[PDB]
Amino acid sequence: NLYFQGNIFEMLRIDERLRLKIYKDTEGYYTIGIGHLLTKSPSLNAAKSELDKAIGRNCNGVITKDEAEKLFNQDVDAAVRGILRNAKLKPVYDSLDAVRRCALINMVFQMGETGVAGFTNSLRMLQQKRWDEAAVNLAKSIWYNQTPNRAKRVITTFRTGTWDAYAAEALELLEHCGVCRERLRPEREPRLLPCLHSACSACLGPAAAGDGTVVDCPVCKQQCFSKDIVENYFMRDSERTVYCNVHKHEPLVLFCESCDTLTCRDCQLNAHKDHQYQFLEDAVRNQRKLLASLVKRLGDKHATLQKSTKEVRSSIRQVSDVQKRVQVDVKMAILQIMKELNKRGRVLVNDAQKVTEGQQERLERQHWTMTKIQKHQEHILRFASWALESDNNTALLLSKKLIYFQLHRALKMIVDPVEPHGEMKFQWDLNAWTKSAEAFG
Amino acid sequence: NLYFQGNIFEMLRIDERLRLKIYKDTEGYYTIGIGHLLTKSPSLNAAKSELDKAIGRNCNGVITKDEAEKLFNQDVDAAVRGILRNAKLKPVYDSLDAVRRCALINMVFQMGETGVAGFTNSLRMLQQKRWDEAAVNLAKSIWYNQTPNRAKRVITTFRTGTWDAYAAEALELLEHCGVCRERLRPEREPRLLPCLHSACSACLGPADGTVVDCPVCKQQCFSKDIVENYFMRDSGSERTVYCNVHKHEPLVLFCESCDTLTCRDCQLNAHKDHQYQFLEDAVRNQRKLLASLVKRLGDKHATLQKSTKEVRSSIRQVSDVQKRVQVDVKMAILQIMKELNKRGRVLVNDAQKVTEGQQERLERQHWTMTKIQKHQEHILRFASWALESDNNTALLLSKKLIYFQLHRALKMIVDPVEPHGEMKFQWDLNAWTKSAEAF
Ligand SMILES: [Zn+2]
Ligand SMILES: [Zn+2]
Ligand SMILES: [Zn+2]
Ligand SMILES: [Zn+2]
Ligand SMILES: [Zn+2]
Ligand SMILES: [Zn+2]
Ligand SMILES: [Zn+2]
Ligand SMILES: [Zn+2]
């Protein structure tokens, strides 16, 4: 079976149905819009208060489509925020591919992060690539018993790693109207608009020069004419042959090429009296051939389209990588320039260190000899000032004089300072503007 | 009026003696060297074990001069370590002058950091610059009754902030030999070498003569140039030394010929016809001359110590110059790298601009492509639904008119990739010749 599907915003659109009026689930909580949980209390006024909290105006329990989809985007983004914020389901969230992360966001949006935080052992089996055990363990839960359809679909999407389980449903819902999503079996008269959507006779809205003749499709809001809509002749059984319009109880069996209208016997002899004709078998086979050719071509063009689409996604990834490339290579190049400059500076300080260690060594030696001179001079001075004691110290003149005569000094070569670096900062303020940003060309 | 000291940490050399043999402390402990406390136990063999552990060689309980002074420097550096390590006496250490700091180091050397950390009440008085209170409170400490001499000297140096209290001792010790620190009385016979140091007759080296090395400054002199210290007969007793060759008649005459105090027998022989000089007249004259010489030397010494201080200032200035050079180089390098980082940020900003523009274009194009893909999937799902054999032919018009809608993948230019394009060759060359270092 041939399946066609989108990605992840769609899936929340397929699982839940859009209702702009406040509604109670047959067994659940008061919700509104597209699966927006207002409150869990039974009181309607509480639900309306939470409604006005979400909208900001008094609505009286009725919303509009744009506001419902704004709340939808808010709810989905908040669910993913509550996923990445929670510390117990994030490590298992990171290791999954887009599709399973996708399914998990759906599960959290339906039951809440705390609701899915209870399913410990199924998550422990899912993180480690043990799929089937997780599926069967997930089947036994209240979430499965309340809404078994959605639960089975989400479990299947976890199992397969593809959106096919919803693609199949997209095809199934193709037999249901796009408004109230009821089965278009002919009780309510089905209608098929030129946009190839199907609806009920009551789900068309309202439905004097001009009263109608113009109608907006309820799902895609593409304008078409009231005459171009035909009853969905496809929902007829599960007889095949339809009876003629003007000719009651008289089946159609000829195809008029003049009027291009499938016709009845009496019609193509009276009305289409001189028109062309084809026996139904040959014309039906012909048109089936043509439409099969068109669908093959459309499938080919769509395949090439999505291939080019993913190539463009790859191209945006690559432009972001190019941006990182340029920025980090510039940072590292300038860092290398500053590194070679710091190396030059560290080698330069060594020269000041050498000259200063030399001069300081000479002056330190000079200071040492000067301290020795000072000390032994003080000694001579005390011993000579010891002439105060009245005595016949004449017998000690020779030692006291000739040693008092000890006068000496030293000397070192006076040197100049080297404190200026003498950098030409003008050259560097000019050289700062030497920035090249080439291109691939 | 004789303050001459002008030193820094010889004060420990003046307070504590030098002993190459083990000696018993004033406290009764086993000590050696220059006030190095080995242990407080009475047993000597423990003292010899700690000594050989500290010295490193087999000593047999006796050390030499240079290694003892090695231990002196070692102990002083360890005392300063124990000062800067302790958190009770470091804040009080910083607020002191160099001299008062030397005094604190002396106290730590004598009693230990834990010993001086106990005088908390008095220590806090030092950092508040209340000197007299600190002096009086320290004067009544256990340390004062134990070793009152060193305590009085250190307390005077703390009170005054000068080395005067040690200059006095420096002059007092002038009457003691520089070796065994005994009082130079008539016994223990003093001798005065030409280097103007004084020693005992026994402290001039043990068993080649007529040449002898001074025991304290190790200056070579002759065993004949040494004269007995004629200056120290204050004790007891009239007191004139007798002639050299004539062992019985004293020298009372002064010859102007030889400038030598002479005896009368020597006047009969040698200075037979010389000019002589009266007693007082010669002594007063030579006293005048030597006073003039000491004036000259004192002035020269004052200017000398001034030059010494100034030279220390110059060696500080060269270190300040070194710090200046290194920090100015660092700051210049940082400043250029700052403006370089700024230019880099502006270039990255331009790259961000171009890339975000291209990204917006490709994102909206991808959105329209997703729209097309979904609309095509819808048409295809409804058309591939022709499998049910039926009168779908009564629906031809709708299936074809919408099936024929094929449209508009709407392209854009692939933008060239942006590389770097720097010139590190030329720029590392210009980086390698930035330095001047002019004088
Ligand atoms: Zn409906
Ligand atoms: Zn439509
Ligand atoms: Zn008819
Ligand atoms: Zn016709
Ligand atoms: Zn002696
Ligand atoms: Zn000497
Ligand atoms: Zn004479
Ligand atoms: Zn004589």
GROMACS .gro file of C-alpha atoms and ligand atoms in nm, chain A residues 193 195-197 217-222, ligand 2:
model
   11
  193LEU     CA    1  -1.501   2.026  -0.353
  195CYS     CA    2  -0.977   2.108  -0.385
  196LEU     CA    3  -1.029   1.730  -0.350
  197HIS     CA    4  -1.142   1.770   0.010
  217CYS     CA    5  -1.353   2.530   0.145
  218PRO     CA    6  -1.385   2.463   0.521
  219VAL     CA    7  -1.038   2.307   0.556
  220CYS     CA    8  -0.806   2.486   0.310
  221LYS     CA    9  -1.019   2.798   0.249
  222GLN     CA   10  -0.961   2.795  -0.126
  882ZN      ZN   11  -1.008   2.235   0.025
   0.00000   0.00000   0.00000
